[PDB]
């Protein structure tokens, strides 16, 4: 099985998982550790922001790849924002900071 682009999950916009569904392989925590073992930071940033999570970014990446630019705009992984709401739904005020 191999997946280029297809279905995306609703609650978090990560791609679906499975064979009967046009889903992609799961990049587990061990793979993240292995990537960190090398100095690969751009690889990790792409793999966990553009390929999977950042909804706006993964389209701008698509255009560039078709355009032949090979440049990514990471933005912020949408799933993370969801986490914030799950914590903001409690009596916890967690927020981003400028400085």
């Amino acid at each position: 099985h191999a997946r280029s682009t297809g279905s995306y999950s609703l609650v978090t916009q990560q791609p679906l998982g499975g064979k009967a569904q046009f889903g992609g392989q799961r990049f587990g925590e061990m793979e993240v550790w292995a990537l960190e073992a090398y100095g690969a930071a751009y690889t990790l940033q792409e793999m966990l922001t553009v390929k999977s999570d950042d909804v706006n970014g993964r389209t701008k990446m698509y255009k560039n790849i078709v355009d032949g630019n090979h440049q990514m705009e990471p933005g912020m992984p949408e799933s993370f924002n969801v986490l914030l709401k799950e914590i903001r739904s409690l009596g916890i005020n967690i927020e981003l900071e400028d400085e």
Partner: peptide
Amino acid sequence: IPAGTGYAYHQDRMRRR
């Protein structure tokens, strides 16, 4: 990440500051 090429980027940012 603050390691590897990410460390290089962060170090450049901190030195140019």
